Design an enzyme around this catalytic site. Structure first.
Site, mmCIF file in Angstrom:
data_model
loop_
_atom_site.group_PDB
_atom_site.id
_atom_site.type_symbol
_atom_site.label_atom_id
_atom_site.label_comp_id
_atom_site.label_asym_id
_atom_site.label_seq_id
_atom_site.Cartn_x
_atom_site.Cartn_y
_atom_site.Cartn_z
ATOM 1 C CG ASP C 21 81.675 21.349 70.969
ATOM 2 O OD1 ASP C 21 82.760 20.937 70.508
ATOM 3 O OD2 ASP C 21 81.540 21.738 72.149
ATOM 4 C CD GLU C 113 76.695 16.667 76.097
ATOM 5 O OE1 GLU C 113 76.739 16.960 77.312
ATOM 6 O OE2 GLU C 113 76.355 17.479 75.209
ATOM 7 C CD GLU C 122 72.760 22.580 80.698
ATOM 8 O OE1 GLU C 122 71.852 21.963 80.099
ATOM 9 O OE2 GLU C 122 73.813 22.951 80.137
ATOM 10 C CG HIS C 270 78.973 23.479 73.825
ATOM 11 N ND1 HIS C 270 79.478 22.203 73.690
ATOM 12 C CD2 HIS C 270 77.842 23.359 74.561
ATOM 13 C CE1 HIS C 270 78.692 21.352 74.326
ATOM 14 N NE2 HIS C 270 77.692 22.027 74.863
HETATM 15 N N1 LIG Z 1 65.563 13.411 82.521
HETATM 16 C C1 LIG Z 1 65.501 13.562 81.195
HETATM 17 N N2 LIG Z 1 64.660 12.770 80.492
HETATM 18 C C2 LIG Z 1 64.592 12.921 79.166
HETATM 19 N N3 LIG Z 1 65.260 13.774 78.383
HETATM 20 C C3 LIG Z 1 66.083 14.544 79.105
HETATM 21 C C4 LIG Z 1 66.262 14.504 80.481
HETATM 22 N N4 LIG Z 1 67.196 15.444 80.874
HETATM 23 C C5 LIG Z 1 67.557 16.021 79.754
HETATM 24 N N5 LIG Z 1 66.921 15.525 78.646
HETATM 25 C C6 LIG Z 1 67.119 15.915 77.257
HETATM 26 O O1 LIG Z 1 68.385 15.438 76.864
HETATM 27 C C7 LIG Z 1 69.020 16.373 75.974
HETATM 28 C C8 LIG Z 1 70.335 16.745 76.609
HETATM 29 N N6 LIG Z 1 71.575 16.612 75.779
HETATM 30 C C9 LIG Z 1 72.605 17.632 76.183
HETATM 31 C C10 LIG Z 1 72.169 19.097 76.112
HETATM 32 N N7 LIG Z 1 73.081 19.901 76.968
HETATM 33 C C11 LIG Z 1 71.408 16.527 74.281
HETATM 34 C C12 LIG Z 1 72.652 16.014 73.585
HETATM 35 C C13 LIG Z 1 72.384 15.052 72.424
HETATM 36 N N8 LIG Z 1 72.229 13.655 72.915
HETATM 37 C C14 LIG Z 1 73.558 15.121 71.443
HETATM 38 O O2 LIG Z 1 74.622 14.568 71.803
HETATM 39 O O3 LIG Z 1 73.378 15.736 70.369
HETATM 40 C C15 LIG Z 1 68.065 17.558 75.816
HETATM 41 O O4 LIG Z 1 67.393 17.496 74.563
HETATM 42 C C16 LIG Z 1 67.119 17.422 77.013
HETATM 43 O O5 LIG Z 1 65.808 17.838 76.653
#
Ligand SMILES: Nc1ncnc2c1ncn2[C@@H]1O[C@H](C[N@H+](CC[NH3+])CC[C@H]([NH3+])C(=O)O)[C@@H](O)[C@H]1O
Ligand SMILES: Nc1ncnc2c1ncn2[C@@H]1O[C@H](C[N@H+](CC[NH3+])CC[C@H]([NH3+])C(=O)O)[C@@H](O)[C@H]1O
Ligand SMILES: Nc1ncnc2c1ncn2[C@@H]1O[C@H](C[N@H+](CC[NH3+])CC[C@H]([NH3+])C(=O)O)[C@@H](O)[C@H]1O
Ligand SMILES: Nc1ncnc2c1ncn2[C@@H]1O[C@H](C[N@H+](CC[NH3+])CC[C@H]([NH3+])C(=O)O)[C@@H](O)[C@H]1O
Lengths: 350, 333, 333, 348
Positions: C21, C113, C122, C270
């Protein structure tokens, strides 16, 4: 026939068509709710309730008891809605004609929607007035007054259309048959039909004349013979092809007066406007006076025989016409009405 | 009411609407003129002559005497035309119902136009058959036979058009009012409406089934209860939204047989075609058979109580429906 | 359920789907690099680092040390990237939930993010907010604020798509079985589905209403109950079939403020946009006001119970609706 | 187990299954055409869902039908039993067939326990478990299940995996070197069975059949499924993996009715499944491709798939490990194209 009249209003689709008229329904709701003091803890009679919508508006306004009278089978449907809206203790649906049913008590206010084409068609206003026998001496009527408006118009195409249709019969060999002898009868038939549709207000040749019925004062019998005199002072020169009709009603409440208008200057309703044609059109110049009478005579088919007699006072040229309001021609097509030709006073190309 | 019926046909505009249907009028004229020997020097009865057009066709074909029976005020207009066409010696207008008038003699041939929507609507066929009391033993009838055709159709757009209108009554708060308790009633009403208009033949999912009325043999009473069985062999897979109806009549003369068809493969007539919608469409596969019956029962309002029952034999998917000819949806534009 | 979430984000394909994205990733990189002074020689916390991409962006911007917390198995993949990119002295992957791990020091800025559908889906935002226990006083957050936008829309086609699906349970004879008793349940279910996709802004009936969450001030618990009042001034007359939802976030840095928008006027992400359908649409005229509230209640299944209540004030027409974020309808082509 | 039953609580999925005309119509036909197996009999419907099969059984004249359902759907079925006026004949039992109690033994068990490759979702075990309520000589509907496997060639499907994985093979994705994860990405994609359909011309040999007889088999048989195979290659080319589908038979007293999900038959909601070899094998027409497909039950309501394949004439070997619980749904609706070079006569 009365049976047919009530069969027509037995269909949910017809009720729906009326309910979907936002001007009508919305204006009724506003008229009732904005005059809540005329309804709060009061006794109401709904003459010809149909689906029951006006009674529900009265209940929204706080009425203690609403008698909802209905003669068609729709009454059974209204009863279902009173139950499903949990208003059984406040709204009582009474099946039957308002002329024949019995009411338990007298009422503080009567509500109804008794208007037809050019106000009077269908002759429900008589029933509405008849119901006044159940009204307390301090009672109100919603609507309280009705205004019929008349104006002369010019519309050459509408006029010529009639002959275009009747001239079908003016042919000496339709599949070998000479039809011409019936051309006169066909012409008469077409001109006896009031024309239901809308138009550009620029076809109007004079300020409208108003005829008022005050529902608080009027008697039922008053509506069997309606004489509407008129004196028009012509604003435009041209051919007068007939008279245009529309109407307003007013709900005169304690807090405010609310108007429901079907004027061609207003958004359309399912009433549109009505035009009665002269079989012989009249020439008038700006400044002339077009005087005459419109006489509505109640007939046995829930309608009126219409007689219109008009003359241009300056020239003495006369036109007399008979129309049957029970057989109107529904002409409305949805197309934007064109103003008369010669409406451009400045160059259209500029 | 019969009053209502005859008031409807008293208007010249309506006669004009019928007369301007060129297929209808032209086919009647051709049927009569090409079989002139069935009329030449004969006695004719015109059942419901209206403007008198068919009687004039009979006169053109050489008929010696034509009794033209008419119950509406149109009768007066027909009299004017007989006079203006110099046929006073050959066409005799008899005002009144064919069930009540008296005729001077028996006739060689009866002519009429008794067809309505789905052939049977308006119930003029009964009157036409009643007039057979005036028919000589070797006499003829024009039309001689009537075929009603049925076929299943698919038309999502129409179904959703009716459904959308019925769903108005699903609203829980129309200006604050809950209408939903009436939704079932509203759907029933809308889907009882026959849909009058035309359509592309590509919406038909099976070859039509035919039900024949032989007007020479049939008795008046037969039209009081009409049972139409059907068994369709589905040619396409899909949703069956209902049944389409149209009709043909045949003029079986001595010289030739002429057909008047209102089929959707033919030029349009003022009868268009008629469709009955199912409140819920039936899924069917190509090769399946769609079986059932259409039952028409004469009622006290000059019409029929109509029930249509259809089922997909392979799955047992059934549809039961009521149709109200008193309240058609005129969709043509 | 938390297990399922972290299993879902353990797959490299999902990380890839998000990384591809370009608006999202590119906007984050621009936000961080154009505000390099908020990172230069600073201590950073990356909440849910996934692949580690944002941490790498923080390192590009000159950060001295970055704690990258990740609870899914992706954490090991991130560590591989830190090593292969020779950034071991600056990016430190901390495996585990941000709610449970121990960090050696407090941080100057938190990056994350955490946005989902309608911003709140979520429920990562509360974790993001929880992480402020590690934020130094006057520390910054990227994103700094989030705006949820609401607008009423008209879309008959969508309404009938869903209604058409729900009408399956209207069948009185599906293979001989009467399903109709479940129609109410079926309609309720389908219309509880948020519709995820995009649309032409011409379907919107009024200027959007804004609901702002300030991540610097908001507390974690605040996201357990979210009340969004709204008052729309209708610009067009017609049927309101429901409410459209989208969101913006702002990165308010020292050099500039950068916005990430998912509005239908902007390039697609997305996240697309989300629409909630009314089981029955509301009629409104231009000039009317459509008022009500959207109430989101955190439930024990990592989602929200959503209630939308709207009314046309002039007529009192009311609509009450439920939305189930757990069961979206993915409609985009 | 919670999520599994949460999935089937939705009316939309029941509807999706009901709208599969092959499945539903074939079940209805199997039951109605074998009416003597149902007329005045005691029936058990394992996982009745909406209850449709129980209604089919009632149409066939069953005296009493016990309809067991573990998801919330159980109440929707209860509403349908009441509204269809069959309360004295159908008894809805909410709960798992393994945990609920039935008062009687039954004459026949009906169910629809098939998943992708037949075995996915592991409902057949519940189905077989239900035989504790079956009278001796009682019947099973379906009675037997056949899983079919055949080798295929699909160069595009194969190369697609690398095209997707090569996203990670770039030295400066927004300044980041992703390359180190490319291998991991490749392994991940190849662990996914591919759910969709295909042109039968990609199949390189007649399928091999592995039969489970539900009358004879025990629950335990489905914990470890060893499917040996020996293919006689009909076409020469590169073998990229194995295609899977299944048939079930309803063996009644009057006739046997078949439900097939083969690629030669109209498509069902089961589609077909393909497992890729991470390393393709060349084969000649006439060669033998031998090996085994081993399905090992896991705790995730599914199977770990191990495929070992060899061309005996050349000794070229390929091994693969797959996770059936995380399949890739690839189906798009587009007409599947036959392999290039399928023209034996001039196309012009
Ligand atoms: N309380 C928490 N403690 C640790 N880790 C966490 C979490 N809540 C979500 N996550 C992870 O955080 C990521 C979320 N994000 C957004 C996904 N919709 C990942 C984005 C990433 N930082 C990027 O920008 O490529 C995913 O891997 C999730 O397992
Ligand atoms: N003497 C009478 N006694 C009882 N009922 C009567 C009636 N005259 C007309 N009605 C019904 O009154 C309704 C008329 N109106 C308007 C028709 N242009 C229905 C209006 C309804 N209250 C609404 O506002 O929706 C119809 O149902 C008619 O059968
Ligand atoms: N029992 C009856 N006794 C007398 N007259 C009758 C009648 N039933 C119908 N009519 C008239 O017959 C005409 C019917 N048709 C067609 C109407 N769909 C007109 C036929 C005419 N011959 C022509 O073809 O123009 C109308 O005028 C009707 O009043
Ligand atoms: N041990 C078990 N005890 C009870 N119920 C069970 C079950 N295992 C699965 N189910 C249900 O079985 C249904 C599945 N099947 C097929 C889905 N692949 C539905 C069959 C239904 N009878 C129909 O044909 O519509 C779903 O409702 C599932 O909750």
């Amino acid at each position: 026939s009365a049976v047919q009249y009530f069969q027509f209003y037995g269909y949910l689709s017809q009720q729906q068509n009326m309910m979907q008229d936002y001007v009508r329904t919305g204006t009724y709701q506003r008229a009732i709710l904005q005059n809540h003091t005329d309804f709060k803890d009061k006794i109401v009679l709904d003459v010809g309730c149909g689906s029951g919508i006006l009674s529900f508006f009265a209940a929204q306004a706080g009425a203690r008891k609403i008698y909802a009278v209905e003669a068609s089978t729709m009454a059974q449907h209204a009863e279902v809605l009173v139950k499903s809206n949990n208003l059984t203790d406040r709204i009582v649906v009474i099946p039957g004609k308002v002329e024949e049913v019995s009411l338990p008590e007298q009422v503080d206010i009567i509500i109804s929607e008794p208007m037809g084409y050019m106000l009077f068609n269908e002759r429900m206003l008589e029933s509405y007035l008849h119901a006044k026998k159940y009204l307390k001496p301090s009672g109100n009527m919603f609507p309280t007054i009705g205004d019929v408006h008349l104006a002369p118009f010019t519309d050459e195409q509408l006029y010529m259309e009639q002959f275009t249709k009747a001239n079908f019969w003016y042919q000496p060999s339709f599949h070998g048959v000479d039809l011409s002898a019936l051309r006169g009868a066909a012409v008469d038939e077409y001109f006896r039909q009031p024309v239901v549709d809308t138009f550009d207000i620029r076809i109007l040749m004079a300020k409208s004349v108003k005829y008022t019925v005050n529902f608080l004062e009027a008697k039922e019998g008053d509506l069997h013979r309606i004489e509407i005199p008129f004196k028009f002072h012509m604003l435009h020169s041209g051919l007068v092809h007939g008279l245009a009709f529309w109407f307003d009603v007013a709900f005169i409440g304690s807090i405010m007066t609310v108007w429901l208008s079907t004027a061609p200057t207003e958004p359309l309703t399912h009433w549109y406007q009505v035009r009665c044609l002269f079989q012989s059109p009249l020439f008038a110049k700006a400044g002339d006076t077009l005087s005459g009478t419109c006489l509505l005579i109640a007939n046995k088919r829930q309608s009126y025989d219409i007689s219109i007699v008009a003359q241009v006072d300056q020239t003495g040229s006369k036109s007399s016409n008979l129309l049957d309001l029970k057989n109107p021609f529904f002409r409305y097509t949805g197309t934007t009405p064109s103003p008369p030709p010669g409406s451009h006073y400045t160059s259209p190309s500029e």
